[PDB]
Structure 1
Amino acid sequence: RMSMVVSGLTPEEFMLVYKFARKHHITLTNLITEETTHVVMKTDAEFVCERTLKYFLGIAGGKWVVSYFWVTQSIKERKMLNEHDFEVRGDVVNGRNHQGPKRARESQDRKIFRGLEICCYGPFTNMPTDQLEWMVQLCGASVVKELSSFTLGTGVHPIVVVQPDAWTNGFHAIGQMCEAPVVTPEWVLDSVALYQCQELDTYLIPQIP
């Protein structure tokens, strides 16, 4: 009916959130799933959090993404306060005032990656490939697993995502094996924090033609 996960807390802080749940009758899980309604981030006084995977998947899902002060307040006042009044404004990498989760929460009709074909190519450390894929799918994109498996005809646009630093002979040769733009994960990541497709320009990768 209403389910939660948390990111960046401490055993103590978690203890607190459990209390919250216990009282207000909220479900609590370790893993974030389609069902998870809420994601609670540790933040600074101005509601800036670290960029965590739960952060990202949270936004992708359009779920509620609130600062930890949501909790301590609803405790400090024996009442569940307004999700709205505690949301997350930004994060350490993308700026402290970019108000992402709000959009996504209110942009579920027009998802940024509506009508895309995305292939997360090669090894992904930092993040399980399939979690990334899940992420973009949540944003309307369609996942492809094989470079050779991109659809044809226009209207649809294909994109390749690689984590360059994760390899050990040529990941610049990609433009050869297919006719797609190549970018680093950061494209996606920012596209998701901000909830707005980004200038691949900044993310493109040199293809050995």
Structure 2
Amino acid sequence: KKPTRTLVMTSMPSEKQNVVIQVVDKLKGFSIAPDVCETTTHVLSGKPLRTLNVLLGIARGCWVLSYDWVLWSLELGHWISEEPFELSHHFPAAPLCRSECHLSAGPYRGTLFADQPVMFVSPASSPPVAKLCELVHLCGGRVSQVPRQASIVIGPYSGKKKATVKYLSEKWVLDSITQHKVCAPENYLLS
């Protein structure tokens, strides 16, 4: 055998899904994972939307392309160049992490949240906490299992608020990932 790298599909109608599976079957060279993981190198969107799988792809520096790249890859009979079809306009961070991952010295880990405090992610947050903690780690940030260690809290938090802590929304994390820019914390405050 099975090709190691994996090709994931998001916002992808079923009629389009079968086409992809079948271009992978004829052209070989990939394995299809249901979710972006360690092996994923390419992510294909049917409709450019910010799904869990597009966020994660941006964190890993994967190619994030339009369904077009498959159509033409089929018409030609080989995996063509990815660059012409990656969704720069919708996710301006993708092209940055993509290039950054391919010129990486050692293995690739984002540096985005590296100069940030330790964050605690609440379990009752949406998206799910497991994937949203993963996002923060993949991007450079460090997460804590208990709030007392964290200087930043993320998501629904009922407990006594803390003056030495900034309590923010999830979209602060997500928007910083999409813009490849640590957004201003003062306009992502969760109250």
Length-normalised TM-score, structure 1:
0.78
Map of 1:133 onto structure 2: 133
In structure 1, the residue corresponding to 2:131 is in which secondary structure?
A: helix
Map of 2:31 onto structure 1: 27
Map of 1:197 onto structure 2: 182
Is 1:119 aligned with 2:123?
no
User: What aligned pairs does 1:43-122 form with structure 2 within 5 A after superposition?
Assistant: 43=47, 49-91=48-90, 99-108=92-101, 111-116=111-116, 117-122=118-123
User: What aligned pairs does 1:116-195 form with structure 2 within 5 A after superposition?
Assistant: 116=116, 117-124=118-125, 126-150=126-150, 158-163=151-156, 170=158, 173-176=160-163, 179-195=164-180
Structure that is richer in helix per residue: 2
Percent identity, aligned pairs only?
Answer: 25
Once the two structures are TM-superposed, the CA of residue 204 in structure 1 deviates from its matched residue by: 2.0
Aligned mates of 2:35, 2:190 — CA distance in 1: 33
Structure 2, unpaired ranges of 5+: 105-109
Once the two structures are TM-superposed, the CA of residue 63 in structure 1 deviates from its matched residue by: 1.3
Q: Is the 8 A contact 2:112 2:139 kept in 1?
A: yes
Instruction: From the superposition, tell whether residues 163 and 39 of structure 1 become closer, same or farther in structure 2 (CA, over 3 Å).
Output: farther
Q: Is the 8 A contact 2:27 2:77 kept in 1?
A: no
In structure 2, the residue corresponding to 1:55 is in which secondary structure?
A: helix
Aligned mates of 2:89, 2:145 — CA distance in 1: 32
Aligned mates of 1:79, 1:64 — CA distance in 2: 17
Q: Which runs of 4+ in 1 moved over 2 A?
A: 106-110
Aligned mates of 1:90, 1:106 — CA distance in 2: 16
- How many aligned residue pairs are there? 179
Deviates further, 109-118 or 194-203: 109-118
Query: C-alpha deviations, 1:5-33, integer Å up to 9, x for none?
Result: 10011221011111121123211111221
Aligned mates of 1:100, 1:143 — CA distance in 2: 22
Is 1:18 aligned with 2:17?
no
Aligned mates of 1:11, 1:40 — CA distance in 2: 13
Structure 1, unpaired ranges of 5+: 44-48, 92-97, 151-157, 165-169
Of 40, 47, 52 in structure 1, the residue corresponding to residue 44 of structure 2 is 40
Query: C-alpha deviations, 1:101-122, integer Å up to 9, x for none?
Result: 0111233566211143121124
RMSD: 1.9
Aligned mates of 1:107, 1:182 — CA distance in 2: 30
